[PDB]
Nucleic acid binder design. Structure first.
Ligand SMILES: [Mg+2]
Lengths: 83, 124, 208, 71, 99, 138
RNA sequence: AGCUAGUUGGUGGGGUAAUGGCCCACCAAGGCGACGACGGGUAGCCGGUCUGAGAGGAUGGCCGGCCACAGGGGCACUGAGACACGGGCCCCACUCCUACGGGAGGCAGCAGUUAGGAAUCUUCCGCAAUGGGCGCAAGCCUGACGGAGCGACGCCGCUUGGAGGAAGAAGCCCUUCGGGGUGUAAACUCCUGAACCCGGGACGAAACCCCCGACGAGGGGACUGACGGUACCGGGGUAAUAGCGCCGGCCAACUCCGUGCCAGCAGCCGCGGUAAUACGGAGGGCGCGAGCGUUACCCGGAUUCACUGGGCGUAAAGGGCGUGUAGGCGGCCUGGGGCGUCCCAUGUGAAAGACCACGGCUCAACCGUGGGGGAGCGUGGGAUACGCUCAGGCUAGACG
């Protein structure tokens, strides 16, 4: 399954996540196809979420299923706003 | 030589000769000893220096120098070897470690102790 | 950690008076004035002409001593300077001065660099609102350095402030005495600093 | 520190070995590699196989010594 | 695109098959010298069409045999012993210098 | 075998410089002539022309030296201090435009064989093209 | 130094998701090779890591990719996918029970035990985050992972106080007996208040779920913390671990006593055989510092394998010469081609790292964002000065 998912990139206690296009059966850290967004849960930054929306949309169109958290993030960013 | 020549032939990569067959690149090798024999130095030097002939965990049968003004070393005493060439003594490539295993520290060695494995002066 | 211990001995060794005690290091008492010779059993013996390397090393030590710094830290700073664009010399000096403790000292929030460092450690010093407790801190242009509210009413700090009421602040710094503040205006250059040291020598020593 | 165990036993010279070294049959017991002492070297002293000489012996190797006493 | 090569027909001693010596002219990475290195390539001739001494155009292909991965696309220049002949001489020499 | 012509020419020039001679003949070539022209433009030589020693095309290289210097070793200062064939037969050196050497840090020059003709280093840079690094002159 | 007989190619077939000597029948006798095969050794490879001015060199830990193997070997089956790490069959090797016929195994998963060994961790808690799999879903499963524990194992941060304080206590150590050192160091005064106790106290966690809305978008809601009562803040609050190397030269730093070529130090030159700035100790110093040194290894320095950048009359080194094969290399002029070569454009060069900028953790390490580079390689075009290559000429080389 082609998936939009997160990947741990940071450190112990300070996590950082890459919103990403990859196959299901990789490492969560694995050689992913495309970097589309990034997430800081600790909102330490004024910009904690920014995703390239168009790319994400394209991915979705192709067949990429977002993960629960990933999906939520995308929603927050506004990739589903069909208006 | 010439460029063409070089391409034909190749540059001989200088391989470094192992100074120490303590084997494997084992920084320390433990071993059981045979004899505590004292041997004479070289040509401008004269003394009687303390050498232990060691069977090693590497399976080497090498000659190792004992540092230390007063030593305790015996036959089947279990020893550790660090290496380091002794300039006067031939056959010797090895320093026995003091203050470990069965090469106990020099008594009242109280200046450059770290080399000899002798504990801090227990001051009171 | 830090040097810790007999300070003016170092000064004596180096030959140039250094202001690590702050005061007394101003009084006829830094031992430098009536005792110029280096510490030890061989102070009043003929000092043999100093070697190329040796002089450089001395210089390095002097500079390091000035800032009360671990050698490793100094090395790191040097490396950083080297990495960065421009004259490795002046930039290095700026970086050294950019240290929080040094900044505190040169704002006359303390008499001693050591004192300043101590103050920084124990939570007496505010930088732009947030109190920082690590003397290594990088102060950069347009940054404000204040005395803590818990610390404003402290005796020592008050004394220091009084001492600095009229006492000169650097052409890169601008302190508020009565609001107990201190703005950083410019990166402290070689020209700005009367440092009794030659950084070129240090650089030479280090490039090995 | 000096280990005081530097043994001072006497001996009949037995053999001319090369390079100022001498088999010296001890009066106590065995023959040992017994090189000439530095002092002796300094003051000439040609030792001959057939002299009474005193050897400085290590207890770690009592088969190796150093002639201290000429004649 | 599928790989295009230029070489010399060196052998016709096989059925439906021809041998092609590609010569390649390239710099040494370390020494900075142009070295005429080469390789042989076993090529498919669906006709027995091409003859010894022929300069040919070689295309990368779907495999036809193990160690046979190329079809000859087209003939470029026909008949030049000189280049073949060097190779032959080399081969002969290989026989000699030995024990 | 007169194996490299450019190199030979360079050598001849060097020799001439060493002995303070006004001129050497070199065997003729278009390439050689072009190189000479470039040198002249730069300022290393008084100039050149084609002449016929034994009815064979040859090229005069008119030499250039400094003033009669004072003291021991009074001999004039050499205009060309050094010249060196770099892209030798068998040793064909080739540079990209970012890899053209600043020969003597903007004082000496290097002579380049390129698409846009036989040209100097600065000129090459200007015309943003690399090539065969024939020779260095300082 | 030659190697090859399913070996190299063919026809026809099998077998495969598919090509193919993968296999099989038959025919042909090739195929590779010194432009280094086969044979032996060594070895996972790389993105990289260190070093280095760079070119290079070594190495491939962790992290990322791929390969390859799951006691050793062989084989299939099933399935989209395996010749199948915690599936199967079979043999060997091995441990375990056996009512002797036979079965059970596989930690190169986490943890740990044992062994080897210089040397390497807790039979830790959790499904909270991320991710995985199943499932409508709840939810389960999860030694992936999150974290804590141990080890200064590395890097980074901080503390072992600061301000005063003698023309200079004591103690220790030199001394030319006057003095000098340790050293403003201490002691003592002032000030702060790591430790430490109490008070609170997380970010990380908003979704999946419910309902409005069509189960779409959108909106409101609730559950949910291993780390962890930790980070961190608020109050009080004690001056509160300094160690190691060296001290002849390199190389920073000198005196005294003991010792007497001995005991010893040493990485090299070497010091020591009675006045040792090289030994043991003591002061003094100097360098680092919660580390410091030793050893092992690698690079450097070694421009000591030299491409950048070595040489070869005598130092190592011109083969005894000749002819000659491959190979390398090549005069002048004209034209094409444009392979080299150069150039532009773009594709690619994943991320992480390494560079620059900013941002976050009290700084930094560490990490996040953004950007550039980037050797090399592909594709399209261009350029012909220079190699190459074809074609023609020339007489300065060569040959007659
Ligand atoms: Mg003795």
């Amino acid at each position: 399954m082609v998936k939009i998912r997160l990947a741990r990139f940071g450190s112990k206690h300070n996590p950082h996540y890459r919103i990403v296009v990859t196959d299901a059966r990789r490492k969560r850290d694995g050689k992913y196809i495309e970097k589309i967004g990034y997430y800081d849960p600790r909102k330490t930054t004024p910009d904690w979420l920014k995703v390239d929306v168009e790319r994400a949309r394209y991915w979705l169109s192709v067949g990429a299923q977002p993960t629960d958290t990933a999906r939520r993030l995308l929603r927050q960013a506004g990739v589903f706003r069909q208006e | 030589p010439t460029i063409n020549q070089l391409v034909r032939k190749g540059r001989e990569k200088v391989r470094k000769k192992s100074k120490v067959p303590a084997l494997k690149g084992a920084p320390f090798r433990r071993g059981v000893c045979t004899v505590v024999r004292t041997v004479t130095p070289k040509k401008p030097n004269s003394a009687l220096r303390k050498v232990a002939k060691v069977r090693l965990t590497s399976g080497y049968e090498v000659t190792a120098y004992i540092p230390g003004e007063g030593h305790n070393l015996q036959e089947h005493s279990v020893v550790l070897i660090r290496g380091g060439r002794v300039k006067d003594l031939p056959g010797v490539r090895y320093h026995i470690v003091r203050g470990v295993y069965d090469a106990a520290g020099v008594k009242d060695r109280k200046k450059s102790r770290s080399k000899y494995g002798t504990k801090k002066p227990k001051e009171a | 950690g830090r040097y810790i211990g007999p300070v003016c001995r170092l000064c004596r060794r180096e030959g140039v008076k250094l202001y690590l005690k702050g005061e007394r290091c101003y009084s006829p008492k830094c031992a430098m004035e009536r005792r110029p010779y280096p510490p030890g059993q061989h102070g009043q013996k003929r000092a043999r002409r100093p070697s190329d390397y040796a002089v450089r090393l001395r210089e390095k030590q002097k500079l390091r001593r000035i800032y009360g710094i671990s050698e490793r830290q100094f090395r790191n700073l040097f490396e950083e300077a080297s990495k960065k664009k421009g004259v490795t010399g002046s930039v290095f000096l700026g970086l050294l001065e950019s240290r929080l403790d040094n900044v505190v000292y040169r704002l006359g929030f303390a008499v001693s660099r050591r004192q300043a460092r101590q103050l920084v450690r124990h939570g007496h010093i505010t930088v732009n609102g947030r109190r920082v407790d690590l003397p290594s801190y990088r102060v950069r242009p347009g940054d404000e350095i204040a005395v803590a509210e818990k610390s404003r009413n402290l005796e020592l700090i008050r004394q220091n402030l009084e001492a600095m009421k009229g006492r000169k602040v650097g052409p890169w710094l601008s302190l508020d005495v009565e609001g107990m503040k201190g703005k950083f205006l410019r990166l402290p250059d070689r020209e700005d600093l009367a440092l009794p040291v030659n950084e070129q020598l240090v650089i030479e020593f280090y490039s090995r | 520190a000096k280990e005081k165990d530097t043994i001072r036993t006497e001996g009949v010279v037995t053999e001319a070995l090369p390079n100022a070294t001498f088999r010296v049959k001890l009066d106590s017991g065995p023959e040992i590699l017994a090189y000439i002492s530095g002092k002796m070297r300094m003051h000439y002293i040609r030792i001959l196989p057939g002299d009474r000489v005193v050897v400085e012996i290590t207890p770690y190797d009592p088969t190796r010594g150093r002639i201290v006493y000429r004649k | 695109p599928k790989k295009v090569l230029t070489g010399v027909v060196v052998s016709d001693k096989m059925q439906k098959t021809v041998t092609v010596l590609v010569e390649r002219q390239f710099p040494h990475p370390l020494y900075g010298k142009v070295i005429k290195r080469s390789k042989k390539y076993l090529a498919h001739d669906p006709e027995e069409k091409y003859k010894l001494g022929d300069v040919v155009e070689i295309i990368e292909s779907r495999p036809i045999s193990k160690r046979k991965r190329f079809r000859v696309l087209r003939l470029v220049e026909s008949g030049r012993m000189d280049l073949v002949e060097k190779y032959l001489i080399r081969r002969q020499n290989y026989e000699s210098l030995s024990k | 075998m007169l194996t490299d012509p450019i190199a030979d020419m360079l050598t001849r020039i060097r020799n001439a410089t060493r002995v303070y001679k006004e001129s050497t003949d070199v065997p003729a070539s278009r390439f050689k002539e072009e190189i000479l022209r470039i040198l002249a433009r730069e300022g290393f030589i008084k100039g050149y022309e084609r002449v016929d020693v034994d009815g064979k095309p040859y090229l005069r290289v008119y030499l250039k030296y400094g003033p009669r210097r004072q003291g021991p070793d009074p001999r004039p200062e050499q205009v060309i201090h050094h010249i060196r064939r770099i892209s030798k037969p068998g040793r064909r050196v080739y540079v990209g435009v970012k890899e053209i050497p600043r020969v003597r840090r903007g004082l000496g020059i290097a002579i380049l064989s390129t698409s846009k003709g036989v040209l100097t280093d600065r000129e090459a840079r200007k015309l943003g093209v690399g090539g065969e690094l024939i020779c260095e002159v300082w």
